[PDB]
Amino acid sequence: SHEDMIHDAQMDYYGIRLATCSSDRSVKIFDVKNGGQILIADLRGHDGPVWQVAWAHPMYGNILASCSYDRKVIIWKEENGTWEKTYEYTGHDSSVNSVCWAPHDFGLVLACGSSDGAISILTFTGDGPWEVKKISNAHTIGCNAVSWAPSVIPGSLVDQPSSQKPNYIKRFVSGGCDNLVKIWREEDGQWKEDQKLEAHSDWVRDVAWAPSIGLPTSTIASCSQDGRVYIWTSDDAATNCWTPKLLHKFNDVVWHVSWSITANILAVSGGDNKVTLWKESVDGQWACISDVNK
Amino acid sequence: KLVTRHLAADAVINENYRYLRGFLGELARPEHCKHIQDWETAGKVYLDYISVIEMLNQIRQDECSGGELEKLHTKVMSLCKWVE
Amino acid sequence: IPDTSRQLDCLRQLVVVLCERSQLQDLVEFPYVNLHNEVVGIIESRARAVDLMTHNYYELLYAFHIYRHNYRKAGTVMFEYGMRLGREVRTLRGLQKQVNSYLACLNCLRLIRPEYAWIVQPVSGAVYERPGASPKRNYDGESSAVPSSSQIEILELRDLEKEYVLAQTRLTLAKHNPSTAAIAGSSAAEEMVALLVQAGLFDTAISLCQTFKLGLTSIFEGLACKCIRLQQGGEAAQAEAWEWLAANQLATVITTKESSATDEAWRLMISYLDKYESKNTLYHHCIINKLLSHGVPLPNWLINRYKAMDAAELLRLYLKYDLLEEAAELVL
Amino acid sequence: LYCLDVGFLEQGTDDREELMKQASMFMDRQYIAAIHNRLQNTQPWKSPGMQATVRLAWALALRGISQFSEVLEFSEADEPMAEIAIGGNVF
Amino acid sequence: EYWCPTEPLQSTSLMGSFLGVAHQRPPQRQVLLSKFVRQMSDLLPATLYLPYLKMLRGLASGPQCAHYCFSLLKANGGSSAENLQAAGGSPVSWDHFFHSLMLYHEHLRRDLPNTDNIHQRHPPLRGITQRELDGLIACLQLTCTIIDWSESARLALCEHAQWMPVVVILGLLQCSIPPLLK
């Protein structure tokens, strides 16, 4: 159905379940067979408009997370095709925004990004309780988006294509509205100052890390509120060198920037009703091949 | 965990004696038992029960067999302890 | 008697001659030691060979199990007796016998030790009456317990509770109209809830839905329709619906001389909302849509309660009925 | 039709074999044989629909006796009888 | 006596797990008839579509008979071209019947110059195909006979304040339709 506006709509890893989180106060999951659709799940337990969503791998546990405009984090687990209650958190400085799990190379650590002034990381260990990591005094105005970064990318450490197993530690980036971008790395058993940078004096929307499956180059494409875009590239060992370069700037309100599942195509969605689908060519440059209407 | 949680119960329920014996013979290698834990306390009971049933059937088929009945009683009184 | 062959022969002779001697109370009077399993097997074999519901073999087995502290055996014996009664009689007497058998089986299942929480149930059959005549009494067969065909079932407690709830619902439907017994037996939980709502048993329908773990949306829609009928009808509608509204436990703490079906339904809805909260106020939207389908303004108390509890969903639902000035003053 | 119909209800008592062993109609092996011979010879039926109806009714009776009773001797013409019926249009 | 609504396995009064006798159990003839009815309900040929509807209309004579036919068509839950509406089939549910009715209404609106607007009792101007018209009138006559024989369906379908089929049917009656549809 979905009569109101639809936010995000993700699909299962096999192509059967479709989780569409909208503001219609109803989350309906249908089926994919013979080109048709049949309603199979109807979940509802939020207090406001549901925003982002993120899936997980069944080998580590069928767990879904949903964020809404109510400062409440909702988590469900799948058993026998039915999703029930798991972990329900409530109470923050502002409403939760971004939500995503770490890649399968690390585990099932969830990231909570919101304009609350602090960072609350949820870690799923064992088969029951969880752990909370609180980082304060890291954002003056607050966070905005959190994009995970796997360790299987050869662009970060030049030692992967040599029969050497790299470290499996947590690493990601953050670009809140505190006029500062930052990198977070799980070192010294906790979290502290790793690498900060100043490239704006307002708000920054989201970021997208390149999940390269065979490309030894780690890139991050950002998007701000005033159509600002930054392409941070790295291809060194141990320590990386993020270059705050520019590409195709905008003047409207650029919203989302999403990389393909294998770091092949970039999709940028803002206020131009056009999703420029870029792609790396054989000449080491960028080229747009296909578009779409919004 | 999968075998010790489902396979023995399903075999006992559905009389899957052939599959149970095959899986036991495939998993009774010394390396697996020496590498994994709780096996000598979980699957060893089923192994001993299957061996006792097989030897009892062989004895009933071959009438008298004291050499097998001795080992049968030995394994039975050895198993009669892990009920706790 | 030492030899088990002659012991079993004497047991069979006893079980044969007691039906004529009319002295089958010795097993309940004095305890049976060292032969309880033997006599139980003998009685079971005799019941499987001859007799059905004419003799009291199952009753004697149940009495012996109760005397010797046996709950699962008594439960399965009562299950077999109920199966035999259902195979024999099928009308109102058969329905009463099935209900009594289900009740006794639930009691035997609940009277077990607290350490247990399950029960097993196989399959069985009965045929013939007396071995001193021509064989083959009727054209019927028996059932054999085969573990490969999933004949043996493992029942917990919630399934038995749901079965007994369905049985009592069928009993109530037959008491309301004794002609749809097979229909009530073959129908589903949703159909039973709809029938109870159409008859006028909102409490029983809510209990059925809460037992089957469903939603009270149909019962709430029926209650809203009844309330709309009460508001739109005169004193005749009140006098006609009082008989169905008084059966919903109207024992609220209100003022005196309150003989109004409208106020009675309002208090009933208030008590229902106070004793069973909604999942996510979906029933509220359902009632709002049901009232907008008729075109009657919302009551003042409910309007104030909804204004205090929310604000946005009313504006979102007003677009269905196209209410301009109401939404205008609301947003103002 | 009522003369050809005999029923098939059993009894619900032990003393029923002594009453069912003294059957009628089916005990006359000459009448059934003569009827079968006449139906195989096919009387001059000037009505194809009526002939097909008679053949279908006889085939149904034979199949019912074969699937319920057992005091018969031959019952294999049901398929050609039904073929003749559907060829001559009984319905 | 044709088709038992409670199936050969009687739901009312708990039985055992055997089936193959008569009197005490549904006979082999009744079991075969139920199996044939189930097969015909699961597979309906395009040539036997209308004959099946006529057979159902004939069997609906009587209150209990119409109620059993309604229960049968409600339990007949499928999704195929040979079982839904044309090309053989039957109204499997009131929801599917209302969907077919609204599809025919949309087709009539597209044929008429006005879109999503009712009209008055005027000479017919229907442009629907002959097969679809025959199927629609046959389903309508079948449902009418079923409810008239088992008035219980009337009161079961009347309590529908949210669905509101009365407005749709009165609009269809007011629209330009042939006299038999009227």
DSSP string, D22-69: S--STT-HHHHHHHHHHHHH----S-HHHHHHHHHHHHHHHHHHHHS-
Contact between B13 and C147 using a beta-carbon 8 Å cutoff: yes
Using a CB–CB cutoff of 8 Å, tell me whether D9 touches chain E.
Answer: yes
Terminal Cα-to-Cα distance of chain E (whole angstroms): 36
Question: Which of C120, C148, C152 to probe the B interface (max B CBs under 10 A)?
Answer: C148
Q: Do the Cβ atoms of E74 and E93 come closer than 8 Å?
A: yes
For residues B42 and B32, give the distance between their C-alpha atoms in angstroms, rounded to a whole number. 13
Chains B and E contact (Cβ–Cβ under 8 Å for 3 or more pairs): no
Q: Is the dihedral of CA B63, B65, B66, B70 positive or negative?
A: negative
Residue E96's region, left for phi above 0, alpha for psi from -120 to 50, else beta, is: alpha
On the 0-12 / 13-18 / 19+ scale of CB atoms within 10 A, E19 is middle
Q: Do the Cβ atoms of A76 and A92 come closer than 8 Å?
A: no
Closest CA to C119 of C83, C77, C75: C75
Q: Do the Cβ atoms of A86 and A66 come closer than 8 Å?
A: no
Contact between C135 and D17 using a beta-carbon 8 Å cutoff: yes
Chains A and D contact (Cβ–Cβ under 8 Å for 3 or more pairs): no
Closest CA to D29 of D19, D37, D17: D37
What's phi and psi for C284, nearest 5 deg? -65, -45
What resolution in Å is listed for this PDB structure? 8.7
**E strands within chain B?**
none
Return the partners of chain E (3 or more C-beta pairs < 8 Å): C, D
Task: Show residues of chain E in contact with C95, CB under 8 Å.
Answer: 12-13
Q: How many CB pairs under 8 A join A and C?
A: 6
SS3 call for C153: strand
Q: Do the Cβ atoms of A254 and A237 come closer than 8 Å?
A: no
Q: Do the Cβ atoms of E84 and E120 come closer than 8 Å?
A: no
Per DSSP bridges, beta strands A130-135 and A119-124 are: antiparallel
For residues C203 and C199, give the distance between their C-alpha atoms in angstroms, rounded to a whole number. 12
The shortest CB-CB distance from C181 to any of E7, E12, E159 is to: E12
Distance of residue E113 Cα from the nearest chain D Cα, in angstroms: 48
SS3 call for C157: coil
Using a CB–CB cutoff of 8 Å, tell me whether D70 touches chain C.
Answer: no
Residues 15-34 of D with CB under 8 A from C: 15-18
For residues A221 and A114, give the distance between their C-alpha atoms in angstroms, rounded to a whole number. 19
Residues 29-68 of D with CB under 8 A from E: 67
Q: Which two tokens stand for residue D86?
A: 């559907």
- CA E136 to centroid of chain Cα atoms: 10
Using a CB–CB cutoff of 8 Å, tell me whether D20 touches chain E.
Answer: no
Question: Which of E11, E13, E155, E162 to probe the C interface (max C CBs under 10 A)?
Answer: E13
Return the partners of chain C (3 or more C-beta pairs < 8 Å): A, B, D, E
On the 0-12 / 13-18 / 19+ scale of CB atoms within 10 A, A208 is buried
For residues E180 and C184, give the distance between their C-alpha atoms in angstroms, rounded to a whole number. 38
What's phi and psi for E142, nearest 5 deg? -65, -45
Closest CA to A146 of A116, A125, A168: A116
For residues C206 and C197, give the distance between their C-alpha atoms in angstroms, rounded to a whole number. 9
Q: Do the Cβ atoms of A38 and A11 come closer than 8 Å?
A: no
Distance of residue C278 Cα from the nearest chain A Cα, in angstroms: 12
Task: Show residues of chain B in contact with C120, CB under 8 Å.
Answer: none
Per DSSP bridges, beta strands A50-54 and A63-68 are: antiparallel
Return the partners of chain A (3 or more C-beta pairs < 8 Å): C
Task: Show residues of chain A in contact with C282, CB under 8 Å.
Answer: 44
The upper half-sphere exposure of residue E74, i.e. CA atoms within 13 Å in the direction of its Cβ, equals 15
Distance of residue E112 Cα from the nearest chain C Cα, in angstroms: 27
For residues A45 and C243, give the distance between their C-alpha atoms in angstroms, rounded to a whole number. 39
Task: Show residues of chain E in contact with D20, CB under 8 Å.
Answer: none
Closest CA to C102 of C70, C71, C78, C133: C78
- Experimental technique behind these coordinates: cryo-EM
For residues E89 and E29, give the distance between their C-alpha atoms in angstroms, rounded to a whole number. 25
For residues B28 and E119, give the distance between their C-alpha atoms in angstroms, rounded to a whole number. 83
For residues D29 and D25, give the distance between their C-alpha atoms in angstroms, rounded to a whole number. 9
Using a CB–CB cutoff of 8 Å, tell me whether A85 touches chain C.
Answer: no
Q: Is the dihedral of CA A144, A145, A151, A154 positive or negative?
A: negative
For residues C98 and C100, give the distance between their C-alpha atoms in angstroms, rounded to a whole number. 5
Using a CB–CB cutoff of 8 Å, tell me whether C95 touches chain E.
Answer: yes
Interface of B with C (CB under 8 A): 13-15
Q: Is the dihedral of CA C37, C42, C48, C51 positive or negative?
A: negative
Task: Show residues of chain A in contact with C214, CB under 8 Å.
Answer: none
Within 10 Å of residue A186's Cβ, how many Cβ atoms?
17
Closest CA to A108 of A42, A23, A170: A170
Q: Which two tokens stand for residue C62?
A: 């149940």
Distance of residue D46 Cα from the nearest chain E Cα, in angstroms: 30
Contact between C138 and D15 using a beta-carbon 8 Å cutoff: no
Q: Is the dihedral of CA C288, C290, C292, C297 positive or negative?
A: negative
CA distances from C323 to C319, C326, C327 (A): 7, 6, 6
What is the DSSP track for chain A? ---S-EEEEEE-SSS--EEEEESSS-EEEE--BTTB----EEE---SS-EEEEE---TTT--EEEEEETTSEEEEEEEETTEEEEEEEEE--SS---EEEEPPTTT--EEEEE-SSSSEEEEEE-SSS-EEEEEE-SS-SS----EEE--S--TTT-TTSTTT-------EEEE--SSS-EEEEE-BTTB----EEE---SS-EEEEEE---SS-S-EEEEEEETTS---EEEE--SSS-----B--S--SS---EEEE-TTS-EEEEESSSSB-EEEEE-TTSSEEEEE--B-
Tell me chain B's radius of gyration from C-alpha atoms. Answer: 14
For residues E12 and C181, give the distance between their C-alpha atoms in angstroms, rounded to a whole number. 7
SS3 call for B8: helix
Closest CA to A141 of A175, A111, A112, A110: A175
Question: Which of D8, D14, D16, D67 to probe the C interface (max C CBs under 10 A)?
Answer: D14
Task: Show residues of chain D in contact with E28, CB under 8 Å.
Answer: 67
Using a CB–CB cutoff of 8 Å, tell me whether E75 touches chain C.
Answer: no
Closest CA to C222 of C245, C238, C189: C245
